[PDB]
Amino acid sequence: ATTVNGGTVHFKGEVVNAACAVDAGSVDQTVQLGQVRTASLAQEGATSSAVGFNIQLNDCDTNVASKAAVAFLGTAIDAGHTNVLALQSSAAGSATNVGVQILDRTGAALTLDGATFSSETTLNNGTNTIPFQARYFATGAATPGAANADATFKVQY
Amino acid sequence: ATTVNGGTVHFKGEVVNAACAVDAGSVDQTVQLGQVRTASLAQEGATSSAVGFNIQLNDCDTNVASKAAVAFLGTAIDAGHTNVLALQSSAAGSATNVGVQILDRTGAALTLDGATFSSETTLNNGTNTIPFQARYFATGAATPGAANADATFKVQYQ
Amino acid sequence: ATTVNGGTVHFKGEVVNAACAVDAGSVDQTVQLGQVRTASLAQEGATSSAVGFNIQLNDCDTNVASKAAVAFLGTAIDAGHTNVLALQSSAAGSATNVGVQILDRTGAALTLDGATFSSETTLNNGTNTIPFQARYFATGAATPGAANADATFKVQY
Amino acid sequence: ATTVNGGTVHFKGEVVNAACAVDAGSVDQTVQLGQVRTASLAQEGATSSAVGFNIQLNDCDTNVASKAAVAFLGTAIDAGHTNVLALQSSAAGSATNVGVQILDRTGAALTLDGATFSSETTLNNGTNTIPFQARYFATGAATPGAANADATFKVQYQ
Amino acid sequence: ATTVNGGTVHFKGEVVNAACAVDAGSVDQTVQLGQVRTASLAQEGATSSAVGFNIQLNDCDTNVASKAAVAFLGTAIDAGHTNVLALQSSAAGSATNVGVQILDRTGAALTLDGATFSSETTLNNGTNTIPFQARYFATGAATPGAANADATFKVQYQ
Amino acid sequence: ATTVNGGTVHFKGEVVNAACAVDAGSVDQTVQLGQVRTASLAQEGATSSAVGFNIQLNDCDTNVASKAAVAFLGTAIDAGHTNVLALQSSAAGSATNVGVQILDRTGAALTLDGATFSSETTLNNGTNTIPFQARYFATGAATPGAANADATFKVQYQ
Amino acid sequence: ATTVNGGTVHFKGEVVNAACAVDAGSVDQTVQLGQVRTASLAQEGATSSAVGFNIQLNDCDTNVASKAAVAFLGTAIDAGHTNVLALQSSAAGSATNVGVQILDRTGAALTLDGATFSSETTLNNGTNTIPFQARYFATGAATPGAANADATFKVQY
Amino acid sequence: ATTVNGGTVHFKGEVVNAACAVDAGSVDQTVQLGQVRTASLAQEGATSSAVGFNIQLNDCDTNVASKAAVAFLGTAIDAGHTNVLALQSSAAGSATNVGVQILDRTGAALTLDGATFSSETTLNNGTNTIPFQARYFATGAATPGAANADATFKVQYQ
Amino acid sequence: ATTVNGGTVHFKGEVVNAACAVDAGSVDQTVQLGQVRTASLAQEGATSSAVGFNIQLNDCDTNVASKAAVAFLGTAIDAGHTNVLALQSSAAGSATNVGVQILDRTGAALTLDGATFSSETTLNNGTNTIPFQARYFATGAATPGAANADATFKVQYQ
Amino acid sequence: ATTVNGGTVHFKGEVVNA
């Protein structure tokens, strides 16, 4: 009686054949860096404060894997500055002479190549969360504007 | 060994040349006002209680800027009440003849046009928490439903 | 002098014609059950300790209504166990054969169908609080993993 | 042998360039005001009793500063009453025509603008405590309901 | 001089149109009961000794109401044993088959229905005190574990 | 008989095969460190005073394990000081050359990798408490600003 | 006539399987050591005046346990000072190179590891009281500040 | 054998570099002023009986310090009556227009600002005691109600 | 010089519109009944030796009121024995099946209801005293254990 | 005529089977 059409429901995910599976809330997440003053980034090589984002690994099997690492893939600003991530803002008028950096567990910038992985982290039965930090890196005289970027990650067990 | 692609992360931020930087928790926050009885908003001009939301400014350098004002931009319900915010929840199920206001620290409702700033608030060399209040406003008889709203805010430095 | 686009702010809420209105801290909330040892949840029908949450009502004019009742609604775990919440979390790394159970103030499991309301609670002309408990119910052998559940509630007067 | 994921912890603090550091307990605190009768708050200008609360300053240095003053940045209930906070608990249930006044050590209310500092208090080497009080102030005929207000403070060291 | 953001102060209170107001130290209190022997509570229907806690009433006016009473609400341990508090502690390491009973000044357990008020008490102009007791009641074989109950009370003035 | 939708409730827990279960109030807690002085933290390697927190373990069973230890996982400042956390706040406004660090009951800094556990504590057959002290560590010249750090702990029974 | 919601009443306690039960006045307590002088706590190994307190045990039976002892657990100062409880007040304004230490009835410091227990005391069929002293121990040149300490104790029978 | 969790114990105190140490029984002492009739306080300038409390100092040496004075800091009830302490009771049911006054050996009141000091007493090697008196000083017509006043104190040596 | 933070003090009292003021030693006193033998209280109705305390009234004005009386409010053990206070020492190790009784001046036990006042006593101008007796009262067979109770009292002036 | 309240009285004691 009065059965009407609904809509469309989509699904996403991957059937990984690995020790640990990435959390559904960590596969696709956003990191709200906030706002940065150009005064803190005016000098070449200047670095802003960092915010922390975590990656959650579920159903870890310590029987086959003990150490885990993560490598980040993105678009570098330049060959010389390969650890800094360029800005992929959709609209025009974005920030100039700035980028974003993903730090390591030991407070080191991660190379965006795919062959350099994060610091080895011990895995735990069940849920194992590993932390990361995201910060702004100024390659020169900063300029006000939007600043958004994207990066994928690949986990090695 | 068993290297597997995971997902992706989207960094969102803004670079400004002002003297303060809005907090990461303040650039996008979801104030929740709970439920409001129709008895409170039955008549025109009746205002519900207020729920406080505050915008935090970080790394404020007072040597270049003394005070800071915040203005709000949004869609008013009608020209009769240019100080409220129209509901933008969905096509159906929204409440009728109701709205939400944004109150400055002085106690006067702000103007949702993006040009009328708030009262000047002095700053200090550090974290600055500018307080605000959100209350429901009735433009007539309030019918039951949902109530969601979105408003942009701009910060001036004088 | 200079001005900058600060950001965006969202507001959420509901307008109701009932006698009471649910508090902003009670419309949406999260509780921490805490870790539970698998030894405690060994056989079917096992029960763990119960944490406490509550729902806050306001402006409860006893003239309009004197009693309040609550009916919950979530995802059951089995056809037989209609009163046990299923664990609605990420696909991998979730505890199995166990669910969350909601206890009314009379110490009884609340049906999740959405039509069986809780025991009637008398109201007063002012702020009110209705207590509830969350415990764990195991339908077999409990397994290690996380346990997150979401359940809506509906108040009757 | 067995290793189990426990949970997470967050540490919150502030590094400051002042003479005294605010105590951890006084940085975030919940003053309790119990209940107030409408007969006590019946007509405009009424005032309930005052509930005591103090802010503790740790690791003070007499050489760099000798006096301490504070100023509260809250939200005024009305444009005519700038020294009274506005209740903010939920969109429905709060009390009307009632706010809270914060009295300094001289028994005078402090305006909620963040610039009018309270009376100066001489400091001591080491731990120091600055006393205050909080009371209910009625702007008209009080109405039963909840009453929760928030206010941040800025401390100067002349 | 130098100024810094100290912190935030929250106030919690409630204005009510009642004959009496409840004390700030009595609206939210913690009662320590201490350890109790599983040997003493092993039998079904056992009873431990009681711990005394009291609720303070302020600004009582005998003209408005001459008597007062208190009713309690909380989660009952069982359907049969409806006058015993349940356990509101964490989900692990909590003593089962035991609960807490509220004893009125008449030495009787109070039903947790919320509409069953305790015995009437004569009021006087000024501060009043209403005494109560808390003790452990066993529904079977008591087991080792923690015990942290919780309840919410409604005061009736008539 | 009006029936109205109220809202939603979420639960969080982790059923584990462990000797002891972590307390509900300990799986996710906050530690307020108050404030600290730049003049105090000016020198490199200077340590401020330490505030105390603790992890509570419930439902311990000595039969399966008698000793418990935890290890804290976080983001170090750099390779020079691997035992000091790095602040995680908004992109602007945080302090520089200052980090939170954790000390066990032996008064030693804990390495932040999740592989080096704290000193093993003997457990009882009930509630147990593992204490820790969070303190500020300066890697150089301190700078005023906020400091919000995060860490995750992993319990091991052996 | 008029009904008004007053507030909440919390409870605390434990049910333990032991000969004795710790008194409610001793499950948690605050004891004041008073102020002390740096001139007194000048050199290493100094000692302040010892304040007294006690732990009360109720409902004791001697046919299931004859002797009792306690063990204290807290945070030590250094590796070379395993019986000096540290100071836990805040991130500023606390004394340095001085720590509270606990002495049993014999007059010997109790190790803060939680494993070593106090001197055995005989039990009586009734309320028992075990005395203790608290004092300041200087690990070096003491400095002005506050002194707040916490210690968790366990009872062996 | 059958080890069980006992509880927790808190130690509170201070370390100072002065020539005297305040006794633990006087650091946080409580004084009962009894009761007083409204008839005895009917006009400005009234007084009540003065009960005596002592602040005990031990480990004093005359080589370093010779004089000792105590300065009381509290919330003055009025600007004109700056030597009178207000009432930090609950928000309702407290007395009005009635304050507390702190005396000295000489018999005159002490200003509550804290800059001014009491009469200097010559110290002697060992244990010392400084007496004081507390009474009710009316600022006007008296009204019934409780009165709980908290005041800090500093000690000077010269 | 060398000013140090001595500490803090509290003052508790109450201003009442009554013909008499109660002395501090009466408003807060601790009376001790001492150890008793079970054989003395073997049967129901047997009582221990009675100790004597007293309450002191100050500034009693005969013109305002001439007769004084006292009513005690507490927790009765049973609905059959309503004149005996229950024990509130703790939740364990408290003497069972026994309570305390508060006999008036003439020698009769006073009901624990708040409206049952003592025998009228003529008041003398100045300072007066009212003597009361505290004793034990055991139903059934008394058992070893601590016996601590408490009760509030009201005074009526005619 | 005028009914006010005083303070409170705390009784301390023990029971022994000796």
Author numbering:
A (entry chain K), C (entry chain I), G (entry chain E): 2 to 158
B (entry chain J), D (entry chain G), E (entry chain F), F (entry chain H), H (entry chain D), I (entry chain C): 2 to 159
J (entry chain B): 2 to 19
Excerpt from the paper describing this PDB structure:
Uropathogenic Escherichia coli strains use filamentous type 1 pili to adhere to and invade uroepithelial cells. The pilus consists of a flexible tip fibrillum, formed by the adhesin FimH and the subunits FimG and FimF. The pilus rod is a helical assembly of up to 3000 copies of the main subunit FimA, terminated by a single copy of the subunit FimI that anchors the rod to the assembly platform FimD in the outer membrane. The assembly platform FimD in the outer membrane of uropathogenic E. coli is the catalyst of type 1 pilus assembly.
The assembly conditions were further optimized to produce a sample with an average pilus length suitable for cryo-EM, allowing us to determine the overall structure of the FimDHGFAnC complex to 4.1 Å resolution. The 3D-reconstruction of the complex (map I) revealed that the pilus rod sits at an angle on top of the usher. However, the rod was initially not well-resolved due to its flexible connection between subunit FimAn-1 occupying the pore and FimAn-2 emerging from the pore. To address this, multiple data processing strategies in single-particle analysis were employed, which significantly improved the resolution of both the pilus rod and the FimA-bound usher. By combining the maps of the two bodies, we constructed a composite map that includes both the assembly platform and pilus rod, which sits at an approximately 51° angle on top of the usher. Multi-body refinement provided insights into the movement of the pilus rod relative to the assembly platform. Although restrained by the rim of the β-barrel and the extracellular loops of FimD, principal component analysis revealed a twisting motion of up to 11°, as well as side-to-side and back-and-forth motions of up to 19° and 18°, respectively. This flexible connection likely enhances the range of the pilus, enabling it to bind mannose binding sites on the epithelial host cell surface more effectively. Importantly, it is only between FimAn-2 and FimAn-3 that the characteristic angle observed between adjacent FimA subunits within the mature pilus rod can finally be adopted.
